[model samples]
Every structure is written in C-alpha cells, then in structure tokens.
Target: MKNAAKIVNEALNQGITLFVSDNKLKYKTNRDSIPSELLEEWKQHKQELIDFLTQLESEEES
Candidate 1:
C-alpha cells in the first residue's frame, strides 16, 4: 500500500478530497472507494497531510 503522502498526492492528482470519518478513512469522489491499509495509514497521518495540502494551496495562491 502507498504511504499517507502518496495517497494524498493521488487524491490531489485526481481532484478529490481524502478524509477520515467515523474512524474510517475515506475519499470524496464518485465511486466512494478507499484503500485498506492505506486507509489506516491515512488515519495515522490525516492531519499532517491536510496541513501539507493547505500549505501547498497557500503557496499556489501567493
């Protein structure tokens, strides 16, 4: 499975949002699909990745 960052990049590339809800890591997309181990990994580092993306967007806006 991919790491938290890589999966986050994948979501970014696909124009989707990744998040954790009800203790399950999920992605916002048409299919509502998610990775197993990567979901757990995402849960482990969700906030870090979200902060990374937020900073990235901030840089792009600057």
Candidate 2:
C-alpha cells in the first residue's frame, strides 16, 4: 500500500526510531527518539498506525 510504503520509506530516509507501546498512554521518548523536526512526519503518518492496529486485531496470532 502507498500509505505503508510512504510511512516506512520516510522513516528510513529520516533515520527516525519507531516505538510501539503496549499501553497506548505510555510512551518512551528517550535519547533514541525522533528529532524535533521529524515529529510532523510521524503525526502525518498517525493514520497508518491506526490501520496497522486494525489489521493486527483482525488477525489471529499464535
């Protein structure tokens, strides 16, 4: 999907670290986190996260 590729490719191009939290309210913004300039890109890709979670829940995991 274009959205998935754009999100992944942008991250790769920008050298940003992606973090997925087990608890939605809890997040880690440590030294390895994204730089200030790239936060906007993540925000723009937020919907891709929703789509990922939706797809995850729809599947049966072992």
Candidate 3:
C-alpha cells in the first residue's frame, strides 16, 4: 500500500488528479503528455489504489 501512496504523491507533485470511477482508477492532468511509468504503476496497483480511495471517499462523505 505504501507503493500505491507513493504513486499518488508523485501524481499530485506533477499536478495530476487521480480519481476512481466504476471501481477503476483514472487520472487527469493538464500536462500534454503524462508519464507512462506512473500509468503502469496504476495498472500494477489498481485494486490497491481503488480500495484505498474508496475507504478515503466514504470517510470524506461522513
């Protein structure tokens, strides 16, 4: 899970916004070209990221 959080940190540092939709991880960034390495990291940790995000989301709603 630390690796998943690492990905999130790098993305925010690059001004990329990550989201979860339909249980899938997604991202949006203003940069013209996004880094493929981070993209692959998402794929590698998709479920873990989604799980963490959903947990955070519910607490945020509360």
Candidate 4:
C-alpha cells in the first residue's frame, strides 16, 4: 500500500498521469477468478490512462 501511495505522488509530481497493468492475471489463474476489488481498480486505472492520453495530446497541440 505504501508503494502505491508513493507512486501516485510521484506520478502527480512529474505530471505523468496515467497507468495500467494486468494486475488481474498477475495474481490469479484466470480473469474470472479476479476479485471485484481488483477489477474496480483496473477500471479506474484505465480511465486514468485515457485522461493521460488526452492531456498528452493537448500538450502536443500547445
């Protein structure tokens, strides 16, 4: 948990917003076996990744 917090802070500080990972299959045998909590986290992270892509495109235009 501490590591996650640290990474979040670091990414914000660096203006590097966006992250995604296959956290589901990492700890499980199949996607169906993934916990609800992890699925939620992945959904949230994927959104963040989308936001980051938008931000990056805006930067390029500027």
Candidate 5:
C-alpha cells in the first residue's frame, strides 16, 4: 500500500516528531537525514502522508 508506516513508525521510533499544521507535513530534526532523503517519495504519497500525520497529531496529543 502507498503509506507512511515505514516512515511513520521509523520516525516515531527514531524520535523524529511530525505534525500536520498549516497543511504542511512538519518534521523536525536533521540528525539522521533519513526523511530528508525521502522527501520526494513522501510527497508522492501526500494523501496518506498528511492524514497519517493528523493521526499522529492526535495520537501524540492524547
């Protein structure tokens, strides 16, 4: 499936925080430069990307 679990799970486990504010996928940190490299592939799946971020937003919030 076109998804972000590979990234989402990895990010969460890697302690890279993310959020969907301003309609932008906000990811903070450049320590590993992992997602930075996935920018293109990540954008390619923006639909699930943004939505999953929102899910994480709530998940992290609660």
Candidate 6:
C-alpha cells in the first residue's frame, strides 16, 4: 500500500541502489521496494527526482 515515490525516496535515504534492468526498475534494499509500474511513474519524473536521491547519497557519505 506504499506509494512509489515514497518508497524510492526512502530507499535512497537508506542508501539503497536503484536501477533499470530488463526494462524493470529494481531496488537493492530488501527492506524496501517499489512496484515496476510505480517506478515507471517515477522514471517519468526522474530528472526532477534524481537530485533528491543524489543529495541523500551525499548526506550518507557525509
């Protein structure tokens, strides 16, 4: 019942890797995952969302 963007955002916050393979959006975090269709929605706005993910990654390193 979780929203895709929320899942993706949280995964990134938790330092999980997200990528596309075989045309499917996949996340490495076993603790959190998003649906492919929902990921497609995120993909449509990835340019906007990627910055947030990048920021989170930097925060993780810092």
Which structure among the candidates has the greatest TM-score? 3
Better of 1 and 6 by lDDT: 1
TM-score of each: 0.48, 0.40, 0.81, 0.27, 0.58, 0.42
Look at candidate 4 and give me any clashing residue pairs: none
lDDT of 6 by residue, 12-58 (tens): 77666665444445457555444555456566656545654555555
Clashes of each: 0, 0, 0, 0, 0, 0
How many clashing pairs in candidate 1? Answer: 0
Q: Which stretches of candidate 5 lie over 4 Å from their true place?
A: 12-15, 30-36, 60-62
RMSD of each: 5.0, 5.1, 2.3, 10.3, 3.0, 6.6
The deviation in Å at residue 41 for candidate 6 is 1.0
Considering lDDT, where higher is better, how would the candidates rank from best to worst? Answer: 3, 5, 1, 6, 2, 4
Please give the range of 10 consecutive residues that has the lowest summed lDDT in model 6: 18-27
Candidate 4 structure, TM-score to reference: 0.27
Cα shift from native, residue 41, model 5 (Å):
1.7
Error of 6 at 24 (Å): 14
Error of 4 at 52 (Å): 17
**Which candidate leads in lDDT?**
3
Show where candidate 6 strays beyond 4 Å: 1-26, 29-34
The residue-by-residue lDDT of candidate 5 on 1-62, one tens digit each, is 64766766656766675556776776665576565545675567666778877776666464
lDDT of 4 by residue, 26-58 (tens): 122323443455445435554554444445446
Q: How do the candidates rank by TM-score, highest first?
A: 3, 5, 1, 6, 2, 4
C-alpha RMSD in Å of predicted model 6 compared with the true structure = 6.6
Local error of candidate 2 at residue 18 (angstroms): 2.2
lDDT per residue, candidate 1, 2-41, as tens digits? 4556878776666667754544455676654544555565
Q: What pairs collide in candidate 6?
A: none
lDDT of each: 0.62, 0.51, 0.80, 0.41, 0.65, 0.56
